[PDB]
Structure 1
């Protein structure tokens, strides 16, 4: 529905530690079970291909998650994300 990649949630250890929840703000909780087994630090590092391997078969959904992966990384790179999430 939305999946506009909220830089607020994508960089809040609350969601990050709770990937499913992290996906909630991305409308990809659909793949929560497939992406839950993987933390944010790894999620944000995944790729369209890996996502497929998990369960994200939607070229639209996975390739899209790659957008959420970056916003998290950069902010993670800018120490904008609590080291607690790490």
Structure 2
């Protein structure tokens, strides 16, 4: 889950359904699996709700995970193999 090493694992970033499963959020794979991680992590609360993530808790958990990935990305600390 909120192990930064798991969240930023290139294997998981390149497999969003499994990335979501690691957080127990795979039920939203239907709406999110098409979105590459580089785009996915910047989605906001409003967009997540509009895409079917209706539960406040779920949006908060996604946005927390996203934030961790963004931090590594913006420091150029995500392995280039993920891109």
Query: Shorter-chain TM-score category?
Result: 0.7 to 0.9
Q: Deviations over 1:39-65 (max 9, x none)?
A: 111111001111112221111101221
Q: Does structure 2 retain, via aligned residues, the 8 Å contact 1:31–1:56?
A: yes
In structure 2, runs of 5+ residues without a counterpart are none
Q: Which has the higher helix share?
A: 2
Question: How far off is 1:80 after superposition?
Answer: 2.0
> Distance in 2 between the 1:79 and 1:17 partners?
17
**How many equivalent residue pairs?**
83
Q: Does structure 2 retain, via aligned residues, the 8 Å contact 1:45–1:69?
A: yes
In structure 1, runs of 5+ residues without a counterpart are none
Relative contact order, CA 8 A, sep 6+: which one is greater? 2
> Distance in 1 between the 2:46 and 2:3 partners?
23
Which 4+ runs in 1 deviate beyond 6 A? none
Q: TM-score, normalised by structure 2?
A: 0.87
> CA RMSD of the aligned region, Å?
1.3
- Cα 1:56–1:73 change in 2 (3 A) is same
Question: How far off is 1:38 after superposition?
Answer: 1.1
